[PDB]
């Protein structure tokens, strides 16, 4: 259940390595890229982005959009990550890395 310390473009990141992907939590705030859980739960691109584009941006987040390929996506506050896990079922395998 490998969980390493890494940092992409200025931010000290905690990397849970998951069969689908990286995935990612901020060691200054603890938020959690929601597009990694997203695609923990196997969503496709365009269902990620419909998904993301109800739900998610109508709560608190972070639209990273620009740099290193894994650091990017959406980001939220641990408790809504949390949530979302719990919503699509994919929050026991994240659980090491909440």
Known sequence: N????????G??????????????????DDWVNATHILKAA???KAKRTRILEKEVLKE?????????????????????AK???EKFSVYDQLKPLF
């Open 60 to 80: 608190t987040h972070e639209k990273v959009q620009g740099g290193f390929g894994k650091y990017q996506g959406t980001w939220v506050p641990l408790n809504i």
């Open 83 to 85: 949530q979302l896990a």
């Open 42 to 44: 196997n969503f496709a």
């Open 2 to 9: 490998q969980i390493y310390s890494a940092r992409y473009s």
């Open 11 to 28: 931010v000290d990141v905690y990397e849970f390595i998951h069969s689908t992907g990286s995935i990612m939590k901020r060691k200054k």
